[PDB]
Design a protein around this ligand. Structure first.
Ligand SMILES: CCCCCCCC[S@@](=O)CCO
Ligand SMILES: CCCCCCCC[S@@](=O)CCO
Ligand SMILES: CCCCCCCC[S@@](=O)CCO
Ligand SMILES: CCCCCCCC[S@@](=O)CCO
Ligand SMILES: CCCCCCCC[S@@](=O)CCO
Ligand SMILES: CCCCCCCC[S@@](=O)CCO
Ligand SMILES: CCCCCCCC[S@@](=O)CCO
Ligand SMILES: CCCCCCCC[S@@](=O)CCO
Ligand SMILES: [Fe+3]
Lengths: 697, 6
């Protein structure tokens, strides 16, 4: 009944197309896949997809703490190169570049699915760690007329609506319009967040074998919020005076500004010719823009990073411990992305062996025009952490003695051909597939007049086996590969070769056909080779041949034991380490915790005086982690508790509607989410309380 | 700072 591209009946999804690009039951997928449903999201009312993943195993949602500027993730100890997202929407990648990275609001999603480990065999170039694939809402079967009001701490105000219906009797034409407007203050003083998004959609079904769904998304964010750096001195450890910087501290200029604009049009098309062939096609064109005027910190004056800062030097050595150095960046980017994935799915048998053959052509073009300016060492006055003074900063005064321009035009293109077969004999299922990619990149420096290019040709494949016992328990194992081009240039003035990803995984999945439960467990060995590292000569350039190894255990469970009880919980153990690095051999990558775990549960009363009342609570534990690649310090572990109070408005004469109270970080725990270096730390989110009223007419 | 190195 449930479709991999539609809504899931409960908190536990059983269908998914991220792992195979075919509507496949999760037990028959030889890889780890997590699915966060719109229903689960409604439980926590997240502002970003990143927050919605707070309970998902093998995924770290704290690389920026409370900031939701980007949905940047670390999956199984890995992230894309250059601090870029690695997100997909409806099976096509939202290829971003530099600061130009698109973001989709959770209110517009039907699902948020996480794919752990290599996936190039189906998607092309990608980080070894995995990818995020969001699935847009689509026109509903029955009518939908929802209006939602939100009000919470830090002056958060949100109003949204979701409408869907047919325009004719037979249901040949249906539409769906979703929108929201949100204004709120950032956790840190002086910063604000604003978002206005609308998502028009239409589905045309000339016949029962043909579906054409138009999908568009328009979003404007005059202000995306805070995105600065705080030093470890004042966050993880106290300042020389034994005090810490408040969680709402802001080291940026008072006139800092960060904005983003997103425009997307595209469609999803499928047609079944007969029981043997089905054609499927997804395409999207995106034009995203982003601008910022940002003064950010760069750590205290005693920090190695500020070795030769004429401003830090002119300070009493005793004073270097509470003065924070800062820099600025004026950015302005424009990006266009065009993507098309066309598939042919064939179902046929060879004896007792049933087949599902997938062959497709997948390609994308992307260009990003960057016109920025960067301030160097003494480009912005020091900030006295003992007596912080927030003032306007003149971004126009581009002093050539301490700042320079940065105008680049990056172009990327990738075309790939892939084939996959899911052959099943009795209770055995074998997933085999391969993909060949042509990935070309070109970077033109407008200032220098230079131009760097590189054409890559990589082949990747994946094989695995699933055994389906007639009881729901189905063990499995698989081997998958991936590749990730570099954009770095070396001594010889050439772009390096792409690093690679190789993973071995064994696990078990329990999915009973009688009960709505899903439980998964997995053990894996992921390794990234040809990673870039420091030069053994020390020529300010980077060398190849580096290697990082990640291995761990993940177990996730989600299920509605009954009509009044839902349960979600997960556990993650991840041991990442540099196995070959001229500088960090033996260390563990920063921002990567060894242990994580979460448990959530909600109960609903159908009788007694509490009827129509839903109560929930959960906790999320994040192990400790290293604050830099040199492992010179650690970020303490932390535990956060969430709560929920929903009240079905059926008792008062309004079925389908409800009012709720959401609480994140119930005990207002004050913690440092993570640091990527001594001068780059982030406070976690302080307690948040949201009042929600969603009405359906 | 665009980021690996910064
Ligand atoms: C915010 C835009 C909503 C458009 C829908 C307006 C009402 C028409 S339909 O929802 C009921 C028809 O009887
Ligand atoms: C205080 C309990 C009532 C629940 C919230 C109902 C909607 C009000 S607020 O969410 C939007 C105000 O514009
Ligand atoms: C009608 C619902 C009222 C809930 C919103 C109350 C004000 C929140 S914000 O104005 C101050 C937060 O400290
Ligand atoms: C349907 C809700 C509409 C609320 C949006 C009101 C205008 C905010 S933005 O358009 C201008 C901000 O200065
Ligand atoms: C019911 C109408 C509420 C929608 C408006 C939400 C806030 C955006 S705008 O009103 C202020 C922008 O600073
Ligand atoms: C239904 C409300 C329509 C008014 C929206 C006007 C534009 C708001 S956004 O597009 C720019 C905000 O600065
Ligand atoms: C905050 C307003 C929400 C509506 C709840 C009204 C009272 C429900 S119960 O007190 C009586 C039920 O008949
Ligand atoms: C924010 C726009 C919402 C306007 C729609 C109000 C309800 C009318 S329709 O949704 C149901 C008619 O029975
Ligand atoms: Fe950055």
């Amino acid at each position: 009944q449930e479709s991999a591209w539609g809504p899931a009946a409960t908190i536990a999804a059983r269908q998914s197309a991220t792992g195979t690009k075919t509507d496949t039951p999760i037990q028959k997928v030889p890889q780890s896949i997590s699915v966060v449903t719109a229903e689960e999201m409604a439980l926590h009312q997240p502002k970003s997809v990143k927050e919605a993943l707070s309970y998902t195993p093998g995924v770290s949602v704290g690389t920026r703490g409370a900031s939701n500027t980007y949905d940047h993730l670390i999956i199984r100890g890995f992230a894309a190169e250059g601090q870029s997202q690695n997100n997909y929407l409806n099976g096509l990648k939202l290829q971003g570049n530099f600061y130009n990275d698109a973001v989709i609001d959770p209110y517009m999603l039907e699902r948020a699915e996480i794919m752990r480990g290599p996936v190039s065999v189906l998607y092309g170039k990608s980080s070894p760690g995995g990818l995020l694939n969001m699935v847009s809402k689509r026109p509903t079967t029955e009518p939908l007329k929802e209006v939602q009001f939100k009000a919470g701490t830090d002056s958060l105000f949100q109003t949204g609506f979701d409408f869907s219906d047919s325009l004719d009797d037979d249901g040949v034409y249906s539409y769906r319009l979703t929108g929201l407007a949100r204004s709120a203050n950032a956790q840190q003083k002086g910063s604000e967040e604003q978002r206005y998004a609308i998502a028009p959609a239409f589905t045309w079904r000339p016949d029962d074998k043909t579906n054409f769904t138009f999908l568009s998304y328009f979003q404007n964010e005059p202000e995306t919020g805070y995105y600065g750096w705080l030093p470890k001195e004042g966050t993880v450890e106290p300042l020389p005076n034994g005090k810490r910087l408040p969680t709402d501290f802001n080291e940026g200029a008072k006139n800092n500004t960060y904005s983003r604009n997103e425009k997307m049009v595209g469609y999803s098309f499928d047609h079944e010719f007969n029981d043997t062939f089905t054609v499927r096609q997804n395409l999207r064109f995106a034009e995203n823009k982003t601008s910022q005027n940002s003064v950010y910190g760069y750590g205290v004056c005693s920090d190695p990073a500020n070795a030769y800062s004429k401003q830090c030097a002119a300070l009493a050595p005793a004073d270097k411990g509470h003065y924070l150095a800062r820099k600025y960046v004026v950015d302005d980017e424009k990006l266009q992305n065009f993507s098309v994935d066309t598939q042919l799915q064939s179902k046929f048998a060879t004896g007792d062996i049933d087949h599902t053959l997938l062959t497709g052509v997948d390609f994308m073009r992307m260009r990003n025009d960057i016109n920025a300016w960067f301030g160097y060492d003494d480009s912005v006055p020091l900030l006295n952490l003992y007596n912080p003074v927030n003032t306007d900063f003149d971004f126009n005064a581009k002093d050539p003695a301490n700042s320079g321009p940065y105008r680049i035009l990056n172009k990327q293109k990738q075309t790939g051909v892939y084939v996959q077969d899911q052959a099943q004999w009795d209770k055995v299922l074998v997933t085999l597939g391969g993909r060949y990619d042509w990935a070309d990149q070109e970077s033109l420096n407008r200032v220098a007049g230079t131009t760097d290019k590189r054409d890559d040709k990589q082949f990747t494949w994946r094989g695995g086996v699933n055994y389906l016992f007639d009881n729901g328990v189905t063990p499995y194992f698989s081997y998958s590969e991936s590749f990730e081009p570099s954009s770095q240039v070396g001594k010889d003035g050439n772009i390096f070769a792409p690093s690679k990803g190789k993973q071995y995984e064994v696990g078990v999945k329990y999915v009973p056909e009688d009960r709505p439960i899903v439980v998964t467990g997995a053990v894996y060995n992921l390794t990234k080779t040809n990673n870039l590292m420091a030069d053994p000569e020390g020529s300010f350039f980077s060398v190849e041949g580096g290697e990082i190894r990640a291995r761990g255990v993940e177990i996730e469970a989600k299920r509605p034991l009954s009509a009044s009880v839902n349960v979600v919980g997960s556990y993650t153990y991840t041991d990442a380490e540099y196995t070959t690095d001229t500088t960090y051999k033996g260390n563990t990558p920063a921002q990567v915790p060894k242990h994580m775990a979460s448990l959530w549960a909600d109960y609903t009363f159908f009788d007694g005086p509490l009827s129509g009342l839903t109560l929930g609570t959960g906790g999320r534990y994040t192990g400790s982690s290293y604050g830099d690649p040199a492992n010179s310090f650690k970020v303490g572990s932390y535990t956060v508790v969430d709560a929920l109070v929903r009240y079905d408005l059926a008792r008062v004469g309004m079925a389908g509607s409800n009012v709720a109270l959401h609480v994140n970080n119930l005990f207002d725990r004050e913690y440092v989410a993570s640091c990527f270096n001594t001068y780059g730390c982030f406070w976690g989110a302080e307690r948040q309380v949201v009042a929600t009223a969603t009405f359906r007419f | 700072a665009a980021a690996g190195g910064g």
